[PDB]
Structures are given as structure tokens and as C-alpha cells.
Design an enzyme around this catalytic site. Structure first.
Site, short mmCIF file in Angstrom:
data_model
loop_
_atom_site.label_atom_id
_atom_site.label_comp_id
_atom_site.label_asym_id
_atom_site.label_seq_id
_atom_site.Cartn_x
_atom_site.Cartn_y
_atom_site.Cartn_z
N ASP A 71 7.00 7.12 2.02
CA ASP A 71 5.92 6.18 1.75
C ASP A 71 6.48 4.90 1.14
O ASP A 71 7.23 4.94 0.16
CB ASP A 71 4.88 6.79 0.81
CG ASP A 71 4.12 7.95 1.44
OD1 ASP A 71 3.76 7.85 2.59
OD2 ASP A 71 3.90 8.93 0.77
N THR A 115 1.28 0.29 3.87
CA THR A 115 2.52 0.25 3.12
C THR A 115 3.67 -0.30 3.97
O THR A 115 4.00 -1.48 3.88
CB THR A 115 2.89 1.65 2.59
OG1 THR A 115 2.97 2.57 3.69
CG2 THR A 115 1.86 2.13 1.59
N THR A 116 4.26 0.57 4.78
CA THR A 116 5.34 0.17 5.67
C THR A 116 4.90 -0.93 6.63
O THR A 116 5.64 -1.90 6.83
CB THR A 116 5.88 1.37 6.47
OG1 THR A 116 6.47 2.32 5.58
CG2 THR A 116 6.92 0.91 7.49
N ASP A 139 -2.98 10.86 0.04
CA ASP A 139 -3.33 9.85 1.03
C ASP A 139 -4.48 10.32 1.92
O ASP A 139 -5.40 9.54 2.19
CB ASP A 139 -2.11 9.52 1.90
CG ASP A 139 -1.07 8.69 1.17
OD1 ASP A 139 -1.38 8.17 0.13
OD2 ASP A 139 0.03 8.57 1.67
#
Lengths: 526, 47, 535, 50, 100, 199
Positions: A61, A94-95, A391
Site C-alpha cells: 500500500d 494511493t499508488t 481498506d
């Protein structure tokens, strides 16, 4: 050799200015992005990072990777701070957000070296950002089948998608079903503090269990707690903040005795006060007595002879959840106990899951909380599992209240680049080189979703360009067949807010970098 | 000790306004050495 | 480049970047598999009835020789983040089942070793990890097909003793191959709860004293504590014990709060002297009024009490610890009494002969209880000729107790000796070709890895693994698959039904599941960021 | 105008174009340059701009 | 395990990235001296000898380079002087961009 | 009279102005939804009162010991009841809260807020129209302030306490700034200050 006055202006300060400083700032952003480039998509890899304590973390993550990189460059930190926000606001963002924000700068990097003052770039970034965000709102889909199996299926599909890119392969149907149902146990605040996750070593992923009630880990006990059998079929629970030790004092009293008659009376009084409290706890049915405070040896034997169970030193976090799980209240003084403050459940047992003792409550129909017990073969194995549950719960919680979803994968990003190209081809002048640069960066998502696992990246991206320009715009990259698949029909859906916030954060990140011309670093560092 | 991969080890570069004004300032500095050796009322310099 | 930009300026991204290391490629994956080979090469040497022992030298110079993988792997100084996880694998198996401390490392290593060729064939690292799941399900489903037991945990304990013999056969206590097998069965069945199939680990205590021989290990139906009678002339034998468990010192009661007694007159000074004398007499008579004839006290005694204990023929011991008085009260059916004035006959414990044992020239004075009334706790007393065999005997009996508990939890068993592993490898191979879409190479690799166990067993047994494996695998196909395994001395034939090699079903189910999960979490890594030197 | 990224003597990063806060972080020691910097404080105090 | 070569070995995207930087570090020298609107350079050696020039040939002959990817561009400039005699500035600028 | 509240989150478009005060503390209780919002503010800690000279408890006999603790419970109950009977909804202190104080706060359904900052306590009193009392909770009759809606909410993954004024709006304003980075929010605040000063 130039700044050599007889008296210095400041002290020893480093200062850079101009084109090499902007190129350096963009370059720093490109390098830090490398930490997540291989973490995107269902076939991403995990990273192992060792801290100064010697302990490794295994995760994929972005909200855990970027915080451990020990970034010092003033510009590279920009792509980390925006992750701190997206961790709250979105979760999945995120990424994808880090990679897109870095690409926004790469697309203009070959131009900012030769004129093209950032004042015109920033304005173009704002125009393109507003265009892209409005386009999402015009294509997102909703449902009109609330409080039906159609909404349960929507939430389940959201959970199974959320569990992608985790250490999960065939357990999606196992975890996803419990995540959706666990959240439906909550009140209409859906406050995440009502869902606990606890790790118990031993067993496989499929051996985990969702407990409607609560459990505590049986902390430090005294001699006498081998007694008190652990078999109850209808206990009541007293949650007390009362001290049950003989050595309980007010810490400010001195008992001055002048005769033997009072000597013995004080010795007896200290024992009688303790027994008075214990007798008031009795005659209540509270066969289970729990407290955050110590329960001493005398009380332990009292409860044993009365056929009662007790356990002290319970943390406040679990007592508050226990109150909400058992449907009762927490009372500080024992002088006003009654049947109207006690909790109730159906089963109370001490189990041996993983070898360690755990005291589980279950059977309360008015349980406003729940606990999910993780089982696994290692500390890091369960730690990664816990992250996947946080998540999935976050995505489901939001999907319940906001049913506006978009196609997953790169399907939306291709359509956004299509809309922007249609816009740019109607605008004269320098904007054509700036709106297009924004649009071109949007392909980093379907590209990386292929580069990390092959899929013939060059040609499969050409297929997306050919399809979206002529037909539907829900086409993305499959994992099973190395070709294009329709994400809409496959129900590969993500909340619309994931991309809306990703566009906003990535745009602002670019404007923070290109708007800087000078960096000043004070020499005083000790 | 693994070195940093560099080109032109132990060299320096200065460019831009620091040179355009730098070189002129150097000329201004040296110009003053003999400022008082022009007119008929000059003073003697002991070197 | 780092620390050098195209403009000649330094380029610094992260703190102390020049002291870091990163290498991704396929090299992270090969490094992880290679490091695992170093771990597997260690544990393979202690597998089977001929398994060789390890000598572990602790940081303080202490030395112990053990066979138990839990004691070998827990004492390692390996500074490698993945090799440390291999130890956690053995820990999870030890905590849940308690048997396969060697097996899960050998199996997991084989999965990593066989995976090496799969990466070189160009198979995506994650597709390899997923392929093992498709094959593992096949082995697990067939593992539950062949299973049977006649154990009822009442009197027909023959297969239960045999299970203990199978487990203990790998340990260094075969001189007591039968004796310790029977002790372990009797220890558990006398405390186990047949209603829930639960066994409370606190109801079996394990004690020991250096000296004698392993054959002198006994199961005592009672408790053993350090006996120290407060009065040295007190008789050391009680034939019929009425036991008072007390948690109060034999001294005049004092308040817990600040007291500071004010004494002014001589009448006050002298009057207190009398009152205190009476307190010493009352606290002892309050015991005799209950019929008690043995007191066991958590606290010590005053000098005044020891004389009264003598004159009232009331033996007692001193400074008995927390868990000791807890166990004594339970074992004897009594209750712990807070004070002297709360003593009553209804809370007294009941026991038979109470004696202390002297050992050679030492003064250990250990308790033995001969008779008890429906006790739910037992004590094992281990002897031995040196400190190392006794500590290893503790682990040897521990394993024997654990596999008995496992049969109580689940009474389904399988045939050992490699028969289960070879049969699973054959089953996976048969389905590996149904259907060879992408995973043909991965599923076959799993089947080959399953054979690492009968092959390592054959090597440690002195047999050639090719000559042994080819015969057994053929015999299990030419005829309806018998429980055909391997052994060193062959014992006639290798029919596991006649050799009585019994292993637990739930044990092997966990070994396959835990080994597979551990392999997955260390394959799906391609970047290690470990710091180097401090400066 | 363009933004500055200024790190002060406490290793804190301030990114802005507002000279009122940039000048407060630049550790000027020259005995005369201080006076033209300090004058800016009376401007900020009186009207808050310019 | 590793090669028993006593030096330092880099493969893959490490060298593919470094050669781009080294080539750029050379083109960055002469890019600023192209055309009538360019400006001259002053080269000063360690002992104090000062050379004034703006041509790509003299500059790259006098300035030392270390990376093996940078020597390629220096040789290219030397060849232009031999074959043509002039124009020795665009051969470094264009060649570096082809790599980029 | 204009404050700024920085909450990490989405971009600038999510900023707003709130007619009241926002704090970043928790309740330590279960009375988080208040509608009548009569606010009593105190400077004393919510754990009783002791002497300033020294204080020492002397006991001579057993009845004096056994009945001592009961006196503390009787006093604490009456002290909280004094303001419960007057309609107190919220009690704000700068100090800690005793375990018995929480017992009675839940008994009488009164919400507690702890504000360690002296300026926050002063601004709150001026906002709601209350007087801070230095002594233990009397039957306060007229020194209580009034809000329209007092509640807690999780905004930007931070739980905040909101004292919202809809009728008595022109007392204080808070400008709530959102952004993706701290650098953005700090720079926007400077723009807010320029506007306040320009006015």
C-alpha cells in the site's frame, strides 16, 4: 569564488535558482515514484522495508511505502504529503495518485527546460483538471434498487474489488462477504471505531471468524483464577470501575489509635469494607464481573465460592466496546447497582484458539460493535491481512451511502484522455501543448496495469485507443485473458470518488512543483 | 568506499549573472590600484 | 545517478542514500530461494528415526543438546528477513499442533527449491504462487479420504499408546519407548474433559531432579512442592491429611494503613504484652477446632508459632508459592482461606499419605502425595543421569502429551512413514494434467516437492532415494493403493498397518496449509530495503 | 511571482511567496541589512499589506 | 552465488539511465554557445592558464571527462574537425538528443 | 474574531465558513448530541476541591473510617445535581475529570468538554455568552451561554467538537480550510489574514 564580501549577508546558506532547480525538483518527484511503480494492479508485487529497529514490514500500500522511505528532498516530499490526505479521503487513491502526479510533471519536463514559463502551465493544469472532473460526473452510474439484493451485490462487488492487489488470491469470497455484513451491524453513523480486528496466530486464512460480540485476551491474573468454571449459558455482565483490593487507600489518611480496642476494630474494619463492596456486587446475577482496575485475591475467592467469574485489568477500549456489545452500562460506584445496568449474552466461554486463552462473548441481539479475529501462520502474514480488511471496510462503508460508481482499471482514464483531446483540438494557440500533456499523463494507469505483468503492453494500449475512439468507453485490461475486456459488464466497479479526488490531489501536486523557482536551505543543522 | 559516479572530478562551474557581473566587478576592483597615478599631483606608491 | 546530477550538483532523495542497497529483477527472488536452501539443509538432517541431534551453545556459554526443532530454530543468529520467517513457520506449527517442527521447514523449502526452475522458464512469479494453490487443494482433499480410528478414550487405548510410541520413537528416550508412552496416556486421560474435548495444559505439571535414570520417571497422582517444615523436629509423615490452605502470616494481625499506636502509660505498655500473647494462642487453636492436622501457608511463621505448632501436634510448611497453593487447593478439593478467623472444616483439603523424599546427599525434600480423592491434576517426575537428557525428556514427553491432546480434539488419523506424502504426490500428478492450460509446470512442481519427505527419510535411513521411491510408487499403483511407506530396518514389510505408524490428520492438514501460505508471502516480493552501516 | 522553498534553522519547510514570512526565516547577520528588513515589520503591523 | 569479478558490475536500467545523463552532461556544455546569440566560455586550468573560446572542439579537448559514454561525444567532435573542418557544435547537440 | 481551522483533506473547493467554534478534542462520554445547549464553563477541575494550606485526614476509630468514603459520593452527587436541575447541557473545564465525575455526568446526561488552552476557554465564554466560574458547580442560574447545535463529527479523519450558532451568528467566525498538503493550507491561511487586515 564570487560571493566574497568583507561582511557576509546571512551565514553560509545554499541557494539554487532557475531551470536546473526546476529540473532537479521534477527529477526528485520522478525518482520517489519508483517506489510504487511495481505495486499497481492485481499482479503487483510487495515490498520489504527494514526499519532502524531491525523489524521488516511487508506491504504494497502506497500509504505504508512512502512513509518509510526517509525522504529528505524538499520536492520529493510533495508526493508523500498528498498520500497522507488520500489515505483519509479515499483509501484506494494511493499508488495511482502518486504515479499520475509524477507523470503530470514528466509530460511537461521536456518543455519547461526551454522557456514556457510556469504561469501558463499552472493555468492549463487548472483548466484540464476541471474538464476531467466534470467528465467523471457525466458518466458515473447509479442504481435505483436500494434495500434489495441488488444493493447487497453492489457492496459485495465493491468489496471483492477493494481486496485486489493484496496478499489475497482465492479468499475474496471469504473475506468480502464478512466485510459487507460486518458493516451492516453498525448504527447510522457507520463509525469505524465499532469494528475491531485482532490477530491470533495459528491456522489458515479461511479459519478466521467474525464475532458479533467482543473478546479480551485474559491478562495478568492472581492465584485462584484457575478456578471459576468458564461455562455459562445465560450470564449477566457487570462492568465496574471499583477497586476490590484489601490495600485500597485514599493515600492521604492516617489512622491514629490509642487503645487495643480500636486496634482490632480498624483491622476488622479494613476487611469489612472490602466485603461490603463484594456483597453489594452479589445478589445481582452478574456472574461475569469485569473491571479495568485490579481484583485481588480475597475477591477472587469470594467470587469462586459464590459461583461467579471475574477478571480485572481489562483495557478501557474493550470495556467501551463490551458496553455497546452487551447493551448495558458502565458503573463506577457499587452502591447503586441494579439489574438495569447489567449486560446480557447467551454464551461466555474461554477458548484456546492458537494455544492462547481468549474469553469470547456472543449472543447479544443488540450488539452495536463486532470483532473480526484473524488467523495466520506468521506475524507479518496476519499484519498484511489486517490491512486488507481496513481498506475493504472503508470502501464498503462509502459505497453504502454513495452508490455512484465507475468502471475499474484504466477504462475511465482512457475516456478522460478522449474528452480532453476533443477539447484541445478546438482551442488555438499554446494551450494545445498543455492540455494534451495533461491528457497524455492519464495513460500511465492502463500502461502500468500492463507493464507489471506483460499483457503485450504496446498493442493492448493501441487496442484501447482504437476501441474507445469508435465504440464504448468501459473497455479495460483483463487479467485472465491477455486482451481487452468490458469492465462494466464484468461488474469491475470502483466508487466514483476514488478518481475525482485522485485528479484533484494530482493536479495540486504538480502546481506545487512547477510554481517554485528558488530553494533556500539554512546551514544550521545539528 | 564505493565512490559516487561523476564526471570531471574536483572541478567547478560558475555561470549566469554571477559571471556577467562577476567579471566586471573584478575589473572594477583592479582598476582602483592606480586611480591616483593620473594627474600632475600624483602621490608615490611604495611597493 | 544519485549524488550527481547532469548540472554537476548533488542529487539527494532519501537520507544517507549512499549507504542503501536495492536490487529487484529476478535476483530478489533467487536470493530468497537460495537463502531458504541454507535453512532447509539444516533441518533435513534431523528428520526420521535416525535424525541426528544438534548442540546449541547459548550467548552466555550454556550448552544443551536437543532434537526438537522448536529448540534448534529458536536459538539462531541469522540476520536475514526471510530466513527469520522460516522460524515463524515452525513456531505456528508448534503452537497449533505441536508435532511437525521439522516437517514444515523441509516441505516449504522444497516448494521454494522446485519453484526455481519455474522462474527460469519465464513463468510470472505470482502465477507460480497461484499455481501452488490449485495443486495444494488436490493434496488436501485426498488427504481426508483415507482415515480411520477405533479410539474411544475409555479403555481401548491401544492405538493411543501406539500414537505416543510413533512420536517418541524420534526422540532420545527410546530406552523408555514403552514406559513414557504409557505415562503420557495416563497423564492426559486422567485430566481431559471428555464433554468438550478440551485438555487444560495447567492440569499436568512436569517436574524433575538430577540423578537416577530415565526408567525412574513416574506419574504421581498429586502435587510435588518444595517441602520445608518450619519446625525441624516435626514428624515428617501424615497418614490421613486434613489440609488447611491459608494465605495469612502466623503473626499478630496488622492493619494495611498507617497505624502509629500511641502508648503513654505503663498499663498501656504491659497490657499490650498480654493481648499480643493471646493472639498467638488463638490463631493456632482456630486451626485445631476444625480438625486440621496439616497447615500449608503462603507466608512464613513467627518463632512463637513454631512452638505452638509442636505442642498442638500440628505440622506445617512455610513460604509455599502462589501457583503451589493454588494447585494444592484444587488437587485436594479445598479452598484458600483468607484469615485465621474464617477457618472452617468445610474448606479443608483431603489427601492420603504425605511424605517428603530425600535424594542422595542433597536436601531437596520433595513432596509426594500417595492417595487423593477425584483429583483433576497430575504431576510427572522426570529423572536422568545428566541435565541434558532431563531437559530433552521434558520436550519428549511434551510432544507425546500434545499428540494425545490432538487426538482428543480430532480422532481422525492417517498412516505415516511417508505413505500419506507419496500418495498425495501421486494424486496431484494424476490431476496435474487435468487440465494443462498454463499451470502444468507449477502443479507438477508441487507434486515433486511433496516427495522431499520420503526422500530425506530414505537418505537418513541409509537408502538410495531412487531405488526406494521408484519401488514404493510403483507398488502403490500396480495394486489398490496400500498404506505402503518406508523404514530403515524394513521390519519385514513396509505395511504401515502392521508397523503401527500413526499420525494425526489435523497435523498434516496444518503442515500443508501453513507451509503453502509461508511460501506465498515470500515469493511475492521483489524489493528489499535493508540499511547498511551506521556511518 | 514564483514561490520559494525555505528551510529555516529548525529544519522546518515553508513554501510561500509572501515576503512577510520569508524574511522572518532568513538569518540575516549583516549589521546594516537588518535595518531595511526590520522596517517591514512596521508596514505589516500598521496595515498588514504592502 | 555472485560473479567472482573483483570490480563493480551494473546491468539493466542502471547503465541505460547513466549513459543518458553522461551524454547530457556533455551536450549541456556546448548548447549555450550555438549561433550568433551564444556567449563565450573561459576555461581555467589548475595552474592558472586561461583559455578563451566558444568552439565545441577546443572546449571538449580541454575539459576532462570520465564516463565512457561521454568520451563517445568527445570523439564525435574530433571527427567533425578532421572530416569537415567546421560545424563542430551541432554534432554533439543532435547526437545527445538521439540518445534521449 | 475570525479564526482559521486547518483540516487535511480534499482541495480548496471544500473550504467553508462556520458561525461558531471548532475544537479538536474528544468528549470522554456518551452525550455527544446536544440540542438545548445551555453551556456552563468552569476553570476548576472536575474532580472535587481540596484545601490550599496542607490537608491531612485523621481517623481515630472504625466508624470514622468505614463511613468516610460515603461522604465523597454524597458531595459529588449533589454538586452535579445542582447544575442538572438548572438545565445544564454542557460543562466545559480546563482540568481533568474524575471517575466519579464521569459516573454522575452520565447519570444526569451532561456532556463534558476538556479545553486545556486558556485562550480557548476565554474565547468560548465570549462566544456563547457565559461566565467562567472558578469554584465547584453551583446551581448556576444566569451564567450559562446558549448555542443552537452542539455536536461532534469526524471531518478529515479527525473528530471535532462544534459549537454552532445559527441565531447569534455575529459573535465569532471560523474559516475552515481544506487541502491536500499542509503547505497549501498554511499558504491559504496567509491569504485569509491579508483579507481580514484589508477589511
Amino acid at each position: 569564488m564570487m560571493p566574497t564580501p568583507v561582511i557576509l549577508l546571512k551565514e553560509g546558506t545554499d541557494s539554487s535558482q532557475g531551470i536546473p532547480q526546476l529540473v532537479s525538483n521534477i527529477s526528485a518527484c520522478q525518482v520517489i515514484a519508483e517506489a510504487v511503480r511495481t505495486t499497481l494492479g492485481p499482479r503487483g508485487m510487495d515490498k520489504l522495508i527494514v526499519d532502524g529497529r531491525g523489524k521488516a514490514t511487508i506491504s504494497n500500500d502506497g500509504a505504508t511505502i512512502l512513509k518509510l522511505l526517509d525522504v529528505v528532498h524538499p520536492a520529493a516530499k510533495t508526493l508523500v504529503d498528498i498520500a497522507k490526505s488520500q489515505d483519509a479521503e479515499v483509501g484506494d487513491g494511493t499508488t495511482s495518485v502518486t504515479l499520475l502526479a509524477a507523470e503530470f510533471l514528466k509530460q511537461v519536463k521536456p518543455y519547461v527546460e526551454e522557456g514556457l514559463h510556469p504561469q501558463i502551465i499552472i493555468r492549463a493544469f487548472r483548466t484540464a483538471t476541471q474538464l476531467a472532473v466534470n467528465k467523471i460526473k457525466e458518466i458515473a452510474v447509479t442504481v435505483k434498487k436500494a434495500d434489495k439484493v441488488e444493493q447487497r451485490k453492489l457492496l459485495e462487488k465493491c468489496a471483492m474489488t477493494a481486496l485486489s492487489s493484496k496478499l489475497i488470491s482465492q479468499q475474496k469470497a471469504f473475506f468480502a462477504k464478512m466485510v459487507v455484513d460486518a458493516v451492516m451491524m453498525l448504527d447510522d453513523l457507520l463509525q469505524l471505531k465499532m469494528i475491531g480486528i485482532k490477530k491470533v496466530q495459528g491456522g489458515a486464512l479461511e479459519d478466521s471468524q467474525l464475532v458479533a460480540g467482543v473478546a479480551f485476551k485474559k491478562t495478568f491474573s492472581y492465584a485462584g483464577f484457575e478456578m471459576q468454571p468458564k461455562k455459562y449459558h445465560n450470564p449477566k455482565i457487570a462492568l465496574l470501575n471499583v477497586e476490590l483490593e484489601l490495600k485500597a487507600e485514599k493515600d492521604n489518611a492516617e489512622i491514629r489509635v490509642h487503645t487495643v480496642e480500636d486496634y482490632q476494630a480498624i483491622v476488622d474494619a479494613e476487611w469489612n469494607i472490602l466485603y461490603d463492596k463484594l456483597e453489594k456486587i452479589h445478589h445481582s446475577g452478574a456472574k461475569v464481573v469485569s473491571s479495568k482496575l485490579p481484583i485481588g485475591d480475597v475477591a477472587t475467592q469470594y467470587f469462586a465460592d459464590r459461583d461467579m467469574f471475574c477478571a480485572g485489568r481489562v483495557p478501557e477500549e474493550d470495556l467501551k466496546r463490551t458496553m455497546m456489545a452487551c447493551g448495558g452500562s458502565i458503573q463506577t460506584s457499587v452502591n447503586a447497582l441494579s439489574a438495569d445496568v447489567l449486560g446480557r449474552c447467551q454464551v461466555f466461554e474461554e477458548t484456546q484458539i492458537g494455544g492462547e486463552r481468549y474469553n469470547f462473548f456472543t449472543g447479544c441481539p443488540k450488539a452495536k460493535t463486532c470483532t473480526f479475529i484473524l488467523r495466520g501462520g506468521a506475524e507479518q502474514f496476519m499484519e498484511e491481512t489486517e490491512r486488507s480488511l481496513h481498506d475493504a471496510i472503508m470502501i464498503v462503508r462509502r459505497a453504502i451511502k454513495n452508490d455512484s460508481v465507475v468502471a475499474g482499471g484504466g477504462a475511465i482514464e482512457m475516456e478522460l484522455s478522449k474528452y480532453l483531446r476533443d477539447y484541445s483540438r478546438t482551442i488555438p494557440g499554446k494551450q494545445q501543448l498543455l492540455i494534451g500533456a495533461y491528457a497524455k499523463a492519464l495513460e500511465i494507469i492502463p500502461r502500468q496495469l500492463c507493464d507489471n505483468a506483460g499483457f503485450d503492453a504496446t498493442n493492448i494500449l493501441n487496442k484501447l485507443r482504437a476501441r474507445h475512439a469508435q465504440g464504448g468507453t468501459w473497455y479495460g485490461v483483463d487479467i485472465n485473458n491477455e486482451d481487452i475486456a468490458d469492465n462494466f459488464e464484468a461488474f469491475v466497479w470502483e466508487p466514483a470518488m476514488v478518481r475525482i479526488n485522485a485528479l484533484t490531489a494530482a493536479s495540486e501536486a504538480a502546481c506545487l512543483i512547477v510554481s517554485v523557482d528558488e530553494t533556500i536551505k539554512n546551514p544550521r543543522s545539528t | 568506499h564505493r565512490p559516487v559516479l561523476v564526471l570531471s572530478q574536483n572541478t567547478k562551474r560558475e555561470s549566469g549573472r554571477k559571471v556577467q557581473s562577476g567579471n566586471i566587478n573584478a575589473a572594477k576592483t583592479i582598476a582602483d590600484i592606480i586611480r591616483t597615478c593620473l594627474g600632475p599631483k600624483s602621490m608615490m606608491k611604495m611597493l | 545517478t544519485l549524488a550527481f546530477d547532469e548540472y554537476g550538483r548533488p542529487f539527494l532523495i532519501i537520507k544517507d542514500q549512499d549507504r542503501k542497497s536495492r536490487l529487484m529483477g529476478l535476483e530478489a527472488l533467487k536470493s530468497h530461494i537460495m537463502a531458504a536452501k541454507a535453512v532447509a539443509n539444516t533441518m533435513r538432517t534431523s528428520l526420521g528415526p535416525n535424525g541426528l541431534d544438534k548442540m546449541m551453545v547459548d550467548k552466555d556459554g550454556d550448552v544443551t543438546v536437543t532434537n526438537d526443532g522448536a529448540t534448534i530454530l529458536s536459538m539462531m543468529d541469522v540476520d536475514h528477513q526471510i530466513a527469520k520467517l522460516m522460524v515463524e513457520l515452525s513456531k505456528s506449527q508448534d503452537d497449533e499442533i505441536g508435532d511437525g517442527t521439522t516437517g514444515v521447514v523441509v516441505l516449504a523449502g522444497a516448494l521454494l527449491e522446485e519453484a526455481e526452475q519455474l522462474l527460469d522458464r519465464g513463468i510470472h512469479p505470482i502465477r507460480i504462487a497461484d499455481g501452488y494453490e490449485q495443486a495444494a487443494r488436490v493434496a488436501i482433499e485426498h488427504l481426508d479420504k483415507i482415515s480411520d480410528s477405533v479410539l474411544v478414550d475409555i479403555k481401548d487405548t491401544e492405538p493411543l499408546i501406539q500414537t505416543a510410541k510413533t512420536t517418541l520413537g524420534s526422540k532420545v528416550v527410546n530406552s523408555c519407548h514403552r514406559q513414557m508412552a504409557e505415562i503420557a496416556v495416563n497423564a492426559v486421560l486422567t485430566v481431559a474433559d471428555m464433554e468438550r474435548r478440551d485438555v487444560d495444559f495447567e492440569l499436568i505439571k512436569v517436574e524433575g531432579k538430577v540423578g537416577g535414570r530415565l526408567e525412574d520417571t513416574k506419574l504421581i497422582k498429586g502435587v510435588i512442592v518444595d517441602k520445608d517444615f518450619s519446625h525441624p523436629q516435626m514428624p515428617k509423615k501424615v497418614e490421613d491429611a486434613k489440609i488447611a490452605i491459608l494465605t495469612c502470616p502466623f503473626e499478630p494481625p496488622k492493619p494495611k494503613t498507617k497505624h502509629k499506636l500511641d502508648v503513654t502509660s505503663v498499663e498501656d505498655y504491659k497490657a499490650l504484652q498480654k493481648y499480643e500473647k493471646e493472639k498467638f494462642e488463638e490463631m493456632i487453636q482456630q486451626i485445631k477446632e476444625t480438625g486440621a492436622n496439616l497447615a500449608i501457608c503462603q507466608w512464613g511463621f513467627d518463632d512463637e508459632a513454631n512452638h505452638l505448632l509442636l505442642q498442638n501436634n500440628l505440622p506445617a510448611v512455610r513460604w509455599v508459592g502462589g501457583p503451589e497453593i493454588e494447585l494444592i487447593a484444587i488437587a485436594t478439593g479445598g479452598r484458600i482461606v483468607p484469615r485465621f478467623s474464617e477457618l472452617t472444616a468445610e474448606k479443608l483439603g483431603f489427601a492420603g499419605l504425605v511424605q517428603e523424599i530425600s535424594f542422595g546427599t542433597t536436601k531437596d525434600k520433595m513432596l509426594v502425595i500417595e492417595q487423593c480423592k477425584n483429583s483433576r491434576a497430575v504431576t510427572i517426575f522426570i529423572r536422568g543421569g545428566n541435565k541434558m537428557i532431563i531437559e530433552e525428556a521434558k520436550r519428549s514427553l511434551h510432544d507425546a502429551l500434545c499428540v494425545i491432546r490432538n487426538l482428543i480434539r480430532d480422532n481422525r488419523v492417517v498412516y505415516g512413514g511417508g505413505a500419506a506424502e507419496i500418495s498425495c504426490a501421486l494424486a496431484v500428478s494424476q490431476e496435474a494434467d487435468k487440465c494443462p492450460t498454463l499451470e502444468q509446470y507449477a502443479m507438477r512442481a508441487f507434486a515433486d516437492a511433496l516427495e522431499v519427505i520420503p526422500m530425506a527419510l530414505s537418505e537418513n535411513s541409509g537408502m538410495n532415494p531412487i531405488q526406494t521411491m521408484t519401488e514404493v510408487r510403483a507398488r502403490q499403483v500396480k495394486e489398490m493403493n496400500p498404506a505402503l511407506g518406508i523404514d530403515c530396518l524394513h521390519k519385514g514389510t513396509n505395511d504401515m498397518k502392521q508397523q503401527h505408524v500413526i499420525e494425526t490428520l489435523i497435523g498434516k492438514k496444518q503442515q500443508i496449509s501453513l507451509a503453502t501460505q509461508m511460501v506465498r508471502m515470500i515469493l511475492k516480493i521483489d524489493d528489499i530495503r535493508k540499511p547498511g552501516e551506521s556511518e | 511571482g514564483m514561490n520559494k522553498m525555505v528551510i529555516n534553522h529548525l529544519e522546518k519547510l515553508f513554501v510561500t511567496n509572501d515576503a512577510a514570512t520569508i524574511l522572518r526565516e532568513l538569518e540575516v547577520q549583516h549589521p546594516a541589512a537588518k535595518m531595511i528588513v526590520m522596517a517591514s515589520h512596521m508596514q505589516e503591523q500598521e496595515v498588514g499589506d504592502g | 552465488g555472485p560473479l567472482s569479478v573483483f570490480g563493480d558490475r551494473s546491468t539493466g536500467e542502471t547503465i541505460r539511465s547513466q549513459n543518458v545523463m553522461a551524454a547530457a552532461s556533455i551536450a549541456n556544455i556546448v548548447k549555450s554557445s550555438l549561433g550568433p546569440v551564444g556567449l563565450d566560455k573561459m576555461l581555467v586550468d589548475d595552474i592558472g592558464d586561461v583559455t578563451i573560446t566558444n568552439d565545441g572542439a577546443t572546449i571538449l579537448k580541454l575539459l576532462e571527462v570520465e564516463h565512457p559514454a561521454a568520451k563517445v561525444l568527445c570523439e564525435l567532435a574530433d571527427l567533425q574537425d578532421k572530416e569537415v573542418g567546421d560545424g563542430t557544435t551541432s554534432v554533439v547537440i543532435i547526437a545527445a538528443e538521439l540518445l534521449k | 474574531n475570525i479564526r482559521v481551522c486547518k483540516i487535511l483533506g480534499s482541495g480548496i473547493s471544500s473550504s467553508s465558513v462556520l458561525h461558531g467554534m471548532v475544537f479538536k478534542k474528544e468528549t470522554e462520554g456518551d452525550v455527544t448530541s446536544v440540542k438545548d445547549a445551555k453551556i456552563a464553563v468552569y476553570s476548576c477541575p472536575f474532580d472535587g476541591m481540596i484545601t490550599e494550606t496542607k490537608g491531612t485526614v485523621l481517623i481515630k476509630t472504625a466508624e470514622e473510617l468505614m463511613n468516610f468514603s460515603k461522604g465523597e459520593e454524597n458531595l459529588m452527587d449533589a454538586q452535579v445535581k445542582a447544575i442538572a436541575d438548572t438545565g445544564a447541557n454542557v460543562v466545559v473545564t480546563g482540568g481533568k475529570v474524575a471517575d466519579m465525575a464521569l459516573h454522575y455526568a452520565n447519570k444526569y446526561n451532561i456532556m463534558l468538554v476538556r479545553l486545556n488552552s486558556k485562550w480557548d476557554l476565554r474565547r468560548l465564554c465570549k462566544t456563547v455568552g457565559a461566565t467562567a466560574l472558578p469554584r465547584l458547580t453551583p446551581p448556576v442560574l444566569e451564567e450559562m451561554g446558549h448555542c443552537d447545535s452542539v455536536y461532534l463529527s469526524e471531518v478529515g479523519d479527525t473528530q471535532v467538537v462544534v459549537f454552532k450558532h445559527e441565531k447569534e451568528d455575529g459573535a465569532i467566525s471560523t474559516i475552515v480550510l481544506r487541502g491536500s498538503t499542509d503547505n497549501l493550507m498554511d499558504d491559504i491561511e496567509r491569504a485569509v489574514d491579508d483579507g481580514v487586515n484589508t477589511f
